Symmetry: D2
Subunit: 500 residues, 4 copies
């Protein structure tokens, strides 16, 4: 309940099929139809070139408004679509890469042509699928629901789940195309009516020359970009949820959140094999939040994996494994909060994944690759949290912080047998978090809870083997997208066949 899709030359027919298995509302376009799920947000506005549609949400309206406001006072009362329409017409499509959010902006032009701009981080992945008709969706399952069990053609698993590094346009669906995040696309049709996408990147590669930014300004920038999101979310939502791990990043977000929201709800998960409760409880107490822990069973851990696969359409094993915890937290917080903040991604920007004390020829490059990889996995899809009535946000994943850190001088990421140095300095400068927390060694979600082990135990493979895990995930991935498995009646106990 959050996704959308559009079909060219489509009618109510093709939509009714979708609506059968998914609830949402249809809407006609000049030459097609637009389907948007129940909990889906959207806005529209008239432009000289046609009607503009903005599907999804914006995370930095404040910044965008401030920008448009330089030349148009009507920027302060503009709805999302009108806001982006102002930037589009004044600064060209490239300006839309400045926007953050799980959005998709497109213009329904009279000539039947669709001009679409995809968000640039992976919050709202969009595919153009060639079925009986051409479909553009941010949820591949919608297409199957409309044209049938065979609509989607999947690639061989031997080819799919083997490598770990892919382009941000990679997709295992042969009869489909993954639109590049942060680019402009025009959906045209040639003389014989065949679909042809014309895409253009909205952002060129940033320099890789070390950024020797002085200490004081750096700290000011970090404080500013981490609080910017929270200040945006401050107005609405009096209460905010936070998956607490007691880790540095998740804890730092809670600290900052304490100064922006009235009430805070912290959640923790772990298995019978291990948990981080001791550290999270320490932060919850220090901040006096409505804390509550939970020890997930094996069945729960697996259910979390397959839920992220279904909802965020993840086919990568590591990603699905990492999401499991988060998905159980959403389930634990359902009905308690409507907004959640995380510390997800910080380790990829400040050097958390680097081994303390180890030597690295080019640590920044190592990190950049990971930042990039999150573009196609589905880790950042928001559909999952949405179906639990949650608007999941990741404060660290902002354009400004990512760009700042992209080539930030390594000495701030790894120095003196430490990691995330500058982030630690900033964290305790807040005088809100306990020293053991601020200086805790990094420990991942799937690691600290031993979810990686629980998963390996059910697949009967070594915790290290992520290719065997991907085989499984890709396997259920196709099963869910082919409609051969309904999220409603599915249990890990009935997936033994997909194991061997």
């Amino acid at each position: 309940s959050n996704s959308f899709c559009v079909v060219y030359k489509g009618s109510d027919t093709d939509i009714n099929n979708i609506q059968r298995d998914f609830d949402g509302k249809g809407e006609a376009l000049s030459n097609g139809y637009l389907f948007i799920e129940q909990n889906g947000h959207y806005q529209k506005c008239e432009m000289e070139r046609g009607t503009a549609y903005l599907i999804g949400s914006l995370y930095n309206r404040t910044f965008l408004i401030g920008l448009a406001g330089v030349w148009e006072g009507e920027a302060y009362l503009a709805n999302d679509a009108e806001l982006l329409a102002l930037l589009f017409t004044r600064l060209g499509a490239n300006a839309l890469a400045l926007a953050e959010g799980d959005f998709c902006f497109f213009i329904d032009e009279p000539n039947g042509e669709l001009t679409v701009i995809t968000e640039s981080r992976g919050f709202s992945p969009v595919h153009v699928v060639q079925g009986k008709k051409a479909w553009m969706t941010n949820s591949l399952k919608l297409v199957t629901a409309a044209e049938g069990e065979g609509a989607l053609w999947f690639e061989e698993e031997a080819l799919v789940c083997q490598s770990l590094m892919r382009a941000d346009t990679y997709t295992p669906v042969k009869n489909a195309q993954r639109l590049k995040p942060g680019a402009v696309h025009v959906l045209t049709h040639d003389s014989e009516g065949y679909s042809f996408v014309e895409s253009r990147t909205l952002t060129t590669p940033a320099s890789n020359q070390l950024l020797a930014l002085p200490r004081e300004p750096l700290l000011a920038l970090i404080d500013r970009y981490l609080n910017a999101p929270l200040e945006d979310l401050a107005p609405r939502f009096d209460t905010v949820g936070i998956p607490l791990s007691g880790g540095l990043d998740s804890s730092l977000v809670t600290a900052l959140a304490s100064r922006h929201f009235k009430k805070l709800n912290t959640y923790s998960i772990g298995t019978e094999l291990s948990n981080e409760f001791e550290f999270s409880q320490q932060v919850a107490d220090a901040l006096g939040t409505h804390h509550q822990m939970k020890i997930l069973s094996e069945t729960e851990v697996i259910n979390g994996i397959i839920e992220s696969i279904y909802y965020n359409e993840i086919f990568d094993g590591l990603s699905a494994e990492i999401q499991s915890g988060l998905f159980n937290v959403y389930r634990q917080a359902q009905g308690q909060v409507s907004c959640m903040l995380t510390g997800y991604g910080s380790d990829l920007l400040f050097g958390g994944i680097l081994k303390p004390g180890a030597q690295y020829d080019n640590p920044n490059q190592l990190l950049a690759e990971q930042v990039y990889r999150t573009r196609w996995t589905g880790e950042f899809a928001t559909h999952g949290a949405s179906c639990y009535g949650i608007d999941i946000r990741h404060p660290f994943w902002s354009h400004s912080l990512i760009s700042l850190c992209h080539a930030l001088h390594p000495d701030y990421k790894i120095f003196d047998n430490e990691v995330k140095n500058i982030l630690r300095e900033y964290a305790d400068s807040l005088q809100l978090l306990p020293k053991d927390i601020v200086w805790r060694k990094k420990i991942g979600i799937h690691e600290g809870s031993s979810v990686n082990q629980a998963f390996a135990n059910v697949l009967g493979s070594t915790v290290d083997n992520y290719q065997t895990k991907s085989r499984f995930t890709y396997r259920v991935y196709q099963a869910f997208l082919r409609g051969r498995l309904s999220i409603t009646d599915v249990t890990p106990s009935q997936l033994k066949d997909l194991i061997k």
Copy 2:
């Protein structure tokens, strides 16, 4: 002996593998290498944006020169690349769609990214293959020769040999994309080095509203556009070859050729099952040409098929079958001529594939689909003829004629129990061809020679079943491209395994 390829960030190494199975030379680019087959033509030009390359040949230089000459005198002595560069900078990339020929234009810029423009008819089909490295080639086999037998991933034949109509960007190779003919493509790379193709069509769909062009002006245009091709080649050749069938179109081309060249070599093929030799001899006598006839055995018919597959990289059954006769003609003319003209495609423009006296709701739409289908088959590829030292030209296939005929009022294509009415009237005003030829009912190459029946006999199927024929063609296609079969040691007798 005419194809080419480019590899992003490739050394002489990646080329050595190719120059091992094929002949040609490799030149280095800013961030890559360019391989050009032994008998392949190409020119270079220095632009401000970088070094421009023109690989292949131009068919309408005279027209392009006359255009560029409107504002720049140097157009009269510009090489092929410099000529297109003038159009490029003066009228934009769209101006290159005005060019005809088996060419590929591209600019190598310092930034590393190349801007390429593909010819717009299918004379030089270009693919972008994602192997160990990104490859752009107008010959897929070259990539196999470069990285191995597993470089190209082929789709399931059940999915490929089904539908008859395909988009002009269709390709059975999963890890490759067929570049749209008549479009501009910029080959860029993102922050992580991954390849991304930004395409934009150079031409939009023409109008489908009936073109009620008065009789006389129409006849003048037909006289003009059919001769222009011959007036371009006249100064470059004294002798010309012509696959003659005694049909209306190839005979009309011969009549014209006799007025532009010194000697004419007409060739005719057939099987022991049937032939059109009778009609062919009439035209040869009337125009007094150096005529030659040849009966083909089943082995030669099949050999002509698998050759068109290998050289023009054709996987379609009907196309491979049709090319058989032509490929046998090339062998017969080898060493006798260096250029050939045909009447190929005329039936797709003037109503020839229409049934005399039959009623049609939308004849032009029917013809248009056929015209379009030629874009992806490889039937217009030139490599085959080229390897036989022949520059193959199809006079009817010019931009002006195709566009003129696109929506030409149907009463000129089918009327009074006749077809190709306007064309027959035109060929008549020439007073050079016998009436029985000018008004002969149309009969295809694969039909009049019963090649269709012979092909059916070996596959043990029915003449009409081009689905089974495609299975065979796609089958050898895959074998040839994977390098599993060699054109030097392949005979129809050793391919019985692909039939079962």
Copy 3:
């Protein structure tokens, strides 16, 4: 009698005021009015971005249709406006610089903001005047007729008649702007309603490197480009008028015209003792044409000068002097022919204005300089010949011929004690003109009839002083544009009052 003007937010009074002195009609536009004289031509076309207007005529429709025909069959029946719209939407504004004619193309966008494109040779000069309201016209007299005598401000004759070489955007009207020929202009208004012309040139300076184009190809191009303008005129007009001087160029046009038209009416003029009749008659008989010479009187010579100034809005001394002869020829045939051809401008392309035997370091530069001068003078305006029911045409002044000669090798224009060497070899090969004509040394219109002497006499100056003669021409130019004088009522009184 074929001019037009456009006024932004004009009222019906503006139009009525104009109609008080000039017959015609006003057509309301989006946010203003468009006026066109009784005998002015104009076509319209509906575009996506608004209504396209094409006022004037096109001289090379055949060539333009051939260009558009490459992709749109409807190009064969498109009106001038539709034809230019096809080129505009397909190849950009730059494509419109490829058309020849005394035209003006503009698009009326609902927002009141029109986009205008001017022809690229000066055949139809266009100004943007800032009176009470903003005007756009190809006739300055219209603004006066509409807003009054004090509408146009003129610069001191001390600054106007001084320098001889000016930019093609030069205008002696301080409150007007001469739109650069061959450029796209966007007429906009800022937030406070002030006019702002955003212009952009559609051409780039051509190369000045010597063109070593061989003799055969060169003669073939001369034949093509010289005969092409006659081919486009053969259809209509059975009888054409030709001002014949007996000069090489005018005679070459008569010979060539004799093989394209049915009836040729040649007209020659001369003053007292100074005439070229002997040579004109030779050609008239050598080609058997309807010839008729007429001796001009003192008053008639001077009147031709004031008429060229009134109609063509010429303020340049030499220009008016030269135009004097042609204006007498138009009157000589004000009802016998509807179309005239001339050899005007030929000397600026082939070196006629060069001194035989003389040595030049850069003759082409000297010539190109003169070619450029004709852009602002008003020599190529069609108004005058129009008001006489004649369609004035100059075969030599085609984009192709001009561009060819631009840097053509000097040995073809001046060599071995001769000039226009290649042009003469061409005429000679026609075996249609007497030797004494093919090699007759260049003699200008104003020189051969001593008009340059007659004009000087009435002013009491020297034949060489054009700075003084320009002061006179500038005097009447101002007078006429202020309506203070009438082309029909030019009494001797006011004449002398203009001498000084």
Copy 4:
């Protein structure tokens, strides 16, 4: 800040002639020279298309850096040139309209073509003069100092000292064009070397619909934007000078300035007739600033007028008269402060120029026209204060604040019996100024000090006839621009010697 100029194909003579009257340096360019005064500021950056130059100063670097930082971390250390280059190549030329300052950005293309972008407020006016050579400067007196007294051709005082409504591109100099502020200008040269300015506005008119922005949001916006300019000057400049009149605005600034800087030096002026020292003093106490009043004699006042005309090249009577007070304040602060803040322009944004209690059909339209009027006057010129070693700043004149007030709902600018209502309400909340001050009343510079009276007394005319006052200003203006008068050598006789 300090004047500069560029001369196409300039010679060393030109430069040395300039250094003869004005001290500075000249750096060679691709095809010309670039001069800059001793106190002139400029930075360069190597671009792909050429070398970029940023002459002047940026006032909103932090904001521009916050924009570029979204995609390029290198923006945090880029110089002014590099920073604009970052925005230019990523968001196009339109992006440079988002920057505020007395700057001029231009790119020296290797071919000689110069791409120039002008600031969008009139802070640094730029002209393109056509004298012996072609020039581009922000000081008309530089071209004279290099060409001679006859460089600049001025228009008759009849069409200058009259009209009150001028376009932002208006200039009294006939042979000089005023480059529209907020636009990109490309200085081309056609095939014959003649100059041609191809301009294009970088902004579009903002909507004129009433802005119904609620109270609280509006107040925050006023606060943020009024303080933003001060946060940019906080780091440097420990001390700041503020011309305090005692009015609502200047006082409010002094108030907000006290919460940012360390030491505030307030200055006030007036005449024998009267002054605002009373109110001015109250503010000096409430804030405890370093306030010194100074009465101006008959001279000094008339001197501040001729000073503004020389340095700011102001020719508008009213404009000069207003700047008269500011200049006298600079001299009173020279050596003591390096930066000054003013409440200048506030009345044009919040309605302070409107008559309290009066009814207006469209009060924002009147205000907008005034705002616009300041674009061609020279009021915001910084050259004047610069020479006094002072960086003059006007906090109210920001793109955001201006854009906000443009259509702000009138009830905020004039309700019941008040004006600047919302501004007054804002100042009140600050709790730093006395009631009688916060709710004072509109009182101009030339008014509060009877400066308009003194100026008038020297001309004999009344204090309302600004046509005679402009008559005087326009005369000295021309005198100075010809060097016929010196800034220092201003004989009290030469005043009258002006036929005045």
